[PDB]
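Cross-posting from the chemistry board since nobody answered there.

I work mostly on the small-molecule side, so proteins are not my area. We synthesized adenosine-5'-diphosphate and want a rough idea of how it might sit in this target. Sequence and SMILES are below. Is it possible to get a predicted 3D structure of the two together?
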Amino acid sequence: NLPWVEKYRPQTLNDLISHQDILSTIQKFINEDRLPHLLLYGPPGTGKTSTILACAKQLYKDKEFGSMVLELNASDDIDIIRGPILSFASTRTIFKKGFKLVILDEADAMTQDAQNALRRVIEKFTENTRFCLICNYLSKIIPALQSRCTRFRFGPLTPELMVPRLEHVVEEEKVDISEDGMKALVTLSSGDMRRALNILQSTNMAFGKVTEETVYTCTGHPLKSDIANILDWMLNQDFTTAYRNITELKTLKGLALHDILTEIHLFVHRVDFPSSVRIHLLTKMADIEYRLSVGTNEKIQLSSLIAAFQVTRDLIVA
Amino acid sequence: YELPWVEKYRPVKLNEIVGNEDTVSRLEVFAREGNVPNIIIAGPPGTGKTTSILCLARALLGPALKDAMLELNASNDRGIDVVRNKIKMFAQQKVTLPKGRHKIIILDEADSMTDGAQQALRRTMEIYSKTTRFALACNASDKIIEPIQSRCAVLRYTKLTDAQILTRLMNVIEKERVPYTDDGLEAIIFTAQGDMRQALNNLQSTFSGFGFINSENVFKVCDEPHPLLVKEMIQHCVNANIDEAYKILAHLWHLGYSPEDIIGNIFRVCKTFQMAEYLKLEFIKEIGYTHMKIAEGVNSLLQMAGLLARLCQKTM
Amino acid sequence: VPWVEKYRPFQEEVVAVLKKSLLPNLLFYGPPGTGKTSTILAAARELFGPELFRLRVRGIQVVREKVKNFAQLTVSGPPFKIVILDEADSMTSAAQAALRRTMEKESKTTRFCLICNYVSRIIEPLTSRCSKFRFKPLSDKIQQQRLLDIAKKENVKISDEGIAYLVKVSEGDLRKAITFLQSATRLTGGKEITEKVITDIAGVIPAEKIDGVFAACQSGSFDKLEAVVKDLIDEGHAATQLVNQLHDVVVENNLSDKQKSIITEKLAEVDKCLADGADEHLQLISLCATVMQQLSQ
Amino acid sequence: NPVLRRPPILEDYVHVTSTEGVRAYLVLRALWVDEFAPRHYTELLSDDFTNRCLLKWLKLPKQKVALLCGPPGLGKTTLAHVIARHAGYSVVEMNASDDRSPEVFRTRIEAATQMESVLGAGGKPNCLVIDEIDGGGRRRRAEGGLLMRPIICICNDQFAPSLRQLKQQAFLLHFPPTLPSRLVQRLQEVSLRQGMRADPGVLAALCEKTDNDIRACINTLQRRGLFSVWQEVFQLFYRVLHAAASAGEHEKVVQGLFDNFLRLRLRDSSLGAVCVALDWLAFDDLLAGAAHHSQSFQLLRYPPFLPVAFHVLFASSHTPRITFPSSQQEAQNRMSQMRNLIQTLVSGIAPATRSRATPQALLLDALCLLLDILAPKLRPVSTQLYSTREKQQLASLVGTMLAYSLTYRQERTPDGQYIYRLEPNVEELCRFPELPARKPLTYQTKQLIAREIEVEKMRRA
Amino acid sequence: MSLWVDKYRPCSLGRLDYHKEQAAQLRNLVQCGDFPHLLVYGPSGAGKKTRIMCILRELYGVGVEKLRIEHQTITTKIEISTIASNYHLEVNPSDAGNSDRVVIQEMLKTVAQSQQLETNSQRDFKVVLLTEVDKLTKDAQHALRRTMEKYMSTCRLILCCNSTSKVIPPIRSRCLAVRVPAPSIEDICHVLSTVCKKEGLNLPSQLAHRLAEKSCRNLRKALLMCEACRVQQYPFTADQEIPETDWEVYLRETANAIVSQQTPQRLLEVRGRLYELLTHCIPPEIIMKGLLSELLHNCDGQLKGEVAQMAAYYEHRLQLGSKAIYHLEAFVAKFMALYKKFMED
Ligand SMILES: Nc1ncnc2c1ncn2[C@@H]1O[C@H](COP(=O)(O)OP(=O)(O)OP(=O)(O)O)[C@@H](O)[C@H]1O
Ligand SMILES: Nc1ncnc2c1ncn2[C@@H]1O[C@H](COP(=O)(O)OP(=O)(O)OP(=O)(O)O)[C@@H](O)[C@H]1O
Ligand SMILES: Nc1ncnc2c1ncn2[C@@H]1O[C@H](COP(=O)(O)OP(=O)(O)OP(=O)(O)O)[C@@H](O)[C@H]1O
Ligand SMILES: Nc1ncnc2c1ncn2[C@@H]1O[C@H](COP(=O)(O)OP(=O)(O)O)[C@@H](O)[C@H]1O
Ligand SMILES: [Mg+2]
Ligand SMILES: [Mg+2]
C-alpha cells in the first residue's frame, strides 16, 4: 500500500515529538505576529519540513493555503530567486491579509551568489514576506544570509521520545516486533524517523517479522557479535588467521568496511586501552577511513586495519 | 510591527559608523570635496560597506539621489546585456548636478557578476568617468578583475574589533533598555565574529526569545557547539588527555551537532586559546587538514576522533 | 556478438515479494554477473504482464527531467511504475544527490530499482529510502562447470586447470572469465590457451617477478631493488597489480606479525597514493625500501 | 594501567594475547588630459621609439595590421591618434561597450575600412583602433589578409597564439619606457595654465611617486601597501597583531613570503624552519585546491595564518631588504611562452603526415635533434661531393629540417651585426644555461644550410 | 625519411624486431573477425605507436600511412588540430584542457556518422585513436566509455597511454589490454646494430651496450643518441663520448649542487635551478625521479631508504597540490636537512 513514511506523516502540531520547545516558540511567534524569518537545520528526517507545514496549515486554511504559501525546493534548480520567489515576495496577498510565507526546502544546495540574491530579496520585503529556510548543514549558508533569520537546530530524535511513535505504527500496521527488534530498529535509525520507518517497512516486506537479526540482515548492518568477534580476532589471533577469519565473515555476510570500521571505532573507545595505544589506533583508523573514500582496494585497507591492531598486541601485553 | 534592529538602528550618516575609522574619514573627505573617483569596497560581510556607500551617495547627491543614483544587487539582473544596456544608457543619461557631483552607479555584491560583465563594465567606467562614478562593493576583492581595481580606489574593510561591537551594542541597549549581563555581552560578541549585522540580529533574536540577555539564553537561541566545552576540548588536547577530549567530543556529537559546526567552532576557539605559538600553529594546520577531510565528504565521528588523537600526539 | 550478453543469466524469491506489494524503492547490488537486470526485467514482466512496457535508463539533469516527463504521465491501471537506473554507482556524488531529490516528488506515481556495486553509491538513499537486496555470486565450482561448458560449445582448447586459473583471475564474479576466454581464444587463434596468455590478458604479474622482488628485498642492497623495480616498470606492469599480488603473497607468508603489519600498512599507503595518481616508480621504490627495512633485520 | 594479567572478577572484558601467547585482558565497558593632449608632432615627448617610427609605416613596407606590446604608460592609445593628426588622416576607435557578435564585428569594421569619407578629400583616409580584444578572433583574422587600412588592437604580449597569426603581417615598433626627461618641463608649462606653483624638486618627487605616469602627474595638480605586512612578519600577543592587521590581498602576500624568506639570514642551520615554512606553503596550496574543489567558503578561514606562520619562525630584529615578488609570475609567464613555442613548433611537424611521437616525448628528446644537425664545418665549395657523400650528409640534414620546418634566417642585433638564428628558435626551448656550451654552427654554414633548404623546397614539386 | 627513428620504423606487424609473440597474437586477433577496442600501454619509447601503426597496416590497406592534417571545432567554442586518414582518426583530446569530454563526444559522433558513408571497403568500422589517455579527466573517461558502448558497432577505439594507473576501471573492464614492455638491452643492441648495418655502418658491441644502458631502455632515445654520436664521429670507439640531452645534465648538476652544500643560499640556488627546469615544461614527476636517482648515487647505503620514502611522499603531495615548486622545494629542503644531519654525525 502507501509507504508508511508519508502514510503516517504528522498533520498537526500535536503529532510532532521531541521538539516541543521549538514548536512552542514558533507558536508564540505566530500568535503574537512577531514571526521572523526561520532557519531550520539538523540531521535529515527530523521533521523540520513537517513542522513548518504544520505551523503554516495552522495559520492558513487550505482554501487560501495554496495562494499564500509558496513551497519550493532548492535542488529543483539563481533564476528561482529572481523569478517565482521575487514575484511572490513583490506583491501582497490575494484574499486574506498579513504576511505571506515562502518555504525553501533543501536550502543548503543553493550557490553562494544565489544565497546573496536571496538575502537581498529577503531584506527588501521583510515587512510582508517571511522566509523559512530548511537545510541540513548550517555551514552551507552564507553568513550574511543567516544574519537575517533566527536559527533553530532540530536535533536527532532520542529513542524514548521516538519509540512511542513507532509503537503506534506497529499497532496500526499489524507486524510482530520483538524487544530486541525494536531496540535494533532504534539503534540503526540513529535519531532519523524517516530511516526508522523505511527500515521497518523494508523488514516487514522482506520477512513479515521484525527482530534484531532480521532487521540487521535487511539493512546489511553488521551485528555487535560480529564486531566483537572481529575485535577479538585482531587482538588475539595471528595476522594470517585473523585476516582469513575477517575476510570469510565479510564475504559471507556482505559487510562493508565503512560500517565495520565505525563499529570497531566505537568498541575501541568502549574498551580500556592504554592512552598511547588508543591514540595510535585512532590515528590509524582515521587514515584507513580516509583511504576508503577515494576508492581504493578494500582488501588492502582491511589488512591495514588488522595491521594497526596487530602491532598493539605486544605493546598491550607488556 | 517594528523594523528589525539591523534596520531600525542602521546608521544614516558616516559620522555614526564604527568600522575602519581611517576609511570612514576618507569617505567623509570625499563627500566634502565632492569629486570622488571610482571606489571599490571589499572586506568581511556586514562591516558597513553598503551603509557607507549609501550614506556617501546620499550626502553627495542630496535631493537628486532619486534620479542621479542607480543601484543594482544580486536580486536584480546584472547580466552581460544589462551592463551593456541599463548601465550604458544610464551613464549617457543627462542629469544636471552641482559642480562637485556626479552620477553614482552602485553595484553591491560586485563579486557576483561574471567575467564578461565586468569586462564590458570596464570601458563604460572609463568613457563616462567625466560625469559618472561607480561605487562597487564585494566581499572578496579577488573576484573583480584587475583592471577594474586598477582604475578604482580599493578601500579595504576589516572585521570590527570587539570594542566597536560592544559600543554599538551598548548604544542599542540604551535605545531599547534591554536588561543584560557582562557574560551575555561577551557571548554576543563571540557569536558576532566581528560582524555588526550578525551581532545585532543575534541580540534582537535573543531579546525576543527570552528578554533578559545572559550567556545561557544567548547560546539557547544562537545554538552552537558551546565555546567553553570546546575550550576544555583543546585544553585536554594540550595535556595529551585523549580520553577527556573524546568524552567532550562524544557528548557534543550525541547532542547532534554536525561535524562541520564542531570543527569550525574548534578552530575559532583555537584563535584565542592561550597556548604556545608554535604549538598553536601546529594545531591550526592539523585542524585545517581535518577540515579538508570533512569538507570533501569524510565527516564521520572517526575523523574528529583522529583529529583529537593527532592533536594529542603533536605535544607527544 | 559478445559471449557475455549471449549467456548472461537463485534469487527468484525476491520477485514474489515484489508481486506481494499489491513498495519501498529497490536497490540491487553485488557482482555484475548475478543477473540483476534480468531479475528485475522478469519481475516487471510478471507483475505488469506482457501488455505493459516500461522505461529503462550520462548526465543528471537530462535523466531527472526525463523521469519527470514519464512519471508525470497517468496510467491506465500496476499502480506504481518502477524506474531502473542501472549503473547507479557510476554516477557522480552530485548526480546521485540530484537523483535522490528526483526520487522524492515522484514517489506518489513512480518508484525506483537502482542497480550498482554496493557501497560505492552515496549514503542518503542508501540509508533509508530504499529496500536493499544483495545478489550472491555463483560458487567457484559452478562457475568452473559453466566455463567448461562454454569452452566445449565454443570449441575452445583450454584445460581444466586453465579454467581454474581463469576463474581465479576473475575474482568473485562472472562474465569476466567469459570475456577473458573470448579475448584469449581470439588472440591465440584458438590453437591453444596457455596459462601465461591468461596472465597477460588479465594483467596479472607472473609470480616469478614477485619472487625476484622478494629476493632483491631480502638481499639487502638498494641497488638490486632499484634494478628490479626499474625492470618491473619497464615490463609495463601496473603498480596497483603489483601491490595487490604482493599483498596477497605477504598476508599468507611466515613473516613476523610486526613485519607483516608494517608491510601491509605501507601497502595501504602506497595504494592510496596510487589512487591519487602519484608516480608508479617512486611509490614502488618506497614500498620495496620498506620491505627491505623489514626483511633485513 | 588498564592492562590486566587475569580476567576481571565482576566486569566485562576482552582478551588480547601477544605473538607468543602470553595473553592479557582489557575492560570492555559499555578636463586637463584632453586640454594638454598632443595636437601636432611638436607635442611629443623624448625617449620614445614608437611615435618616431610609426609614421614611416603609415604613409600611404606593405604590412596589413598592427599590434601593441610592451608595458603601459607609453601613450600607445594617443599614438595612432597623434600620427593621424600629423598626417591629416581620420581616426576611428571602438571597444567592448557594444555586443561583440561576429556579424556586429562585420558591421563595425567593414564600413570603417571599405568606405570613404563624406568630407573633403583631405580627411578621407581613416585610422582604426580596437580596444579590449579579450568569436571575434576569426573575424579579425578573416579580413586581415586582404584589407588596406591598418587596424590597431590593444594588447601587451606579442606571444599570444591569436596575435601571432596577425603578427606575421605587422610592422611592430620597439616599446622602450618613456623617460621623465621632458616630463618635468612639460608639467612645468602646464602649471602656468593651472596657476598653482609646484617646486621642481616636488615635481620630480611627484613624477617618481607615480612612476612617471603622465595620466596621474597631470591630475596631481589638484602605491601598494603590501610591504607593510612583510615588514610586520619578517622583523619585530605579537601574533594576534598579524591576524588583526594582515587584512589585505592574499595570494601576492603568499608569493612575497615565498620569494623573501630564503633571502633572510637569521641562521644557516635553520633547515627545520624552512621545512616547516614549506609545509605551511604546501598546506596553503592544498587549502586553495580544496576550497575550490568543494565549494566550502568556511574552509578558507585558515590561509590568513600563513603570514602568521612565517612569523615566530622568521621573526627577528630589523635586517632583511624585502623585495616585491616576481619569481612566481616570471615562472608562469615564461611557462606560457615556452608552451606557446611548443605549440608553434609542433603545429608544423606532427600533423605533417610524420613525426609519430607525442609532443611531451619530443620535448624531452629534442636535444639530440640539434646534435644530429651539427654538420661539418669544413666549408664545402664544390657543387659536388660536399666534403662527404651528400646522401649521408647535408642533404639528409636539409630533409630533416624541412620535415621539422627548421630554417636559418638573417638577424641583426641593435648593435648592427649580422646574426643567423634558426627560425623556429628551439635552442632556447631545449638548451640550458650554466652548462658547457657547445660551439654553434658558423655564419657561412647557416648561409649554406638555408640555401639548400630554399632549393629543396622548390625541388619537392 | 631521413632520421633513423622514422626511416627504420617497420610498417607491418610481421617485420617487428622484438615482442614478436605479441605481434603474432595481434595478427591473429586482427585476422579473425569481431575486432574489439584496444588499450595499448607501456613505457614511452617501447613501440606502442609502432605496434598500433602495424595493427592498422594489417587491419586496413597501406593507405592508412597517408595521414592528413585535420582541424575541428567544438561547442562550449574550442578549435583543435587532429590527425586522420581515410580509415581512421587520431587525436590527443587531453590538449583541449578540461573540455576534453565534449571534444571526445563530438569526434566520436562525427566518426560514427562518417563511417556509414561507404567507409567499408575492408572493415565495417573506423578506428578512433587516442593518445595519452592517462591525462584524461575522470568525467571525460566516463563519457569515453559511455560513447564506446554507444557506437561499438560503427567504430572502434584504440587507446595509448604510458600507464594504466590513471585509467578508470570501467574503461579497462571493456577494452583489451595490450601490454608493450620496454625492449631488453639485447633487443636494443640488435635493433641499433640492424639500423647501423642497414645504413652501411659498424657498431661495436660495447658501444651498443653503453647506448642501451644510457638510453634507459627507451628506443627513441637510443636511436637519437646513436645518430648523434655517428654525426659527431663516425669511427666509433669503445670510449665514444656519447652525448645526452641538456636537461638531464642540468638535473644532475642540480643534484650535485644539493649534495655539495646544505645551506639556505644553496637552497635558493637550487630553487632557481628548479624554475629553470620547470620552465622548459618537463613534468614535475620526471624532475623528482631524476633528482632522486642522482641523489642515491651519493647517499650512503643506510640513508637511501629514507630519501626514497621522502621523495615518494613529496611527489604524492605535489600530485595533490597545484604549485609544483612548493613540494619540490620541500623535498629538497628535507633532503638537505637529513643529509646535513647524517654527514655531520
Ligand atoms: N517528529 C516527528 N514525529 C513523527 N514523525 C516524524 C517526525 N519527524 C519525522 N517524521 C517522519 O519522517 C517523515 C519525513 O519527515 P520530514 O521530511 O518532514 O523531515 P525533515 O527533518 O524536515 O527532513 P528533510 O530535510 O530530509 O525533509 C515524515 O513524513 C514522518 O513520517
Ligand atoms: N560600522 C557599523 N556601525 C554600526 N552598524 C553597522 C556598522 N556596520 C554594519 N552595521 C550594521 O549592519 C547592517 C548591515 O550593513 P551593510 O549592509 O552595510 O553590510 P556590508 O558590510 O555592506 O555587507 P554585505 O555586502 O555582506 O551585505 C547595517 O544596516 C547596520 O545596521
Ligand atoms: N609622447 C607623448 N607626448 C605627450 N603626451 C604623452 C606622450 N606619451 C604619453 N603622453 C600622455 O600620457 C598619457 C597616456 O595616455 P594614453 O591613454 O595614450 O596612454 P597609454 O600608454 O596608451 O595607456 P595605458 O597606460 O592605459 O596602457 C596621456 O595623458 C598622454 O597625453
Ligand atoms: N621492432 C622495431 N624495429 C625497429 N624500430 C622500432 C621497433 N619498435 C619500435 N621501434 C622504434 O622505436 C620508436 C618507439 O616510438 P613509439 O612507438 O612512440 O614508442 P612508444 O609508443 O612505446 O612510446 C619508434 O619510433 C620506432 O622507430
Ligand atoms: Mg523534511
Ligand atoms: Mg552589505
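Reply from a structural biologist on the board:
Welcome over. Reading the output above for you: The beta strands of chain A are 38-41, 69-73, 100-105, 129-135, 150-153, 176-177, 209-210. Chain A touches chain B through 51 residues (CB under 8 Å). Happy to explain the C-alpha cell format if needed.
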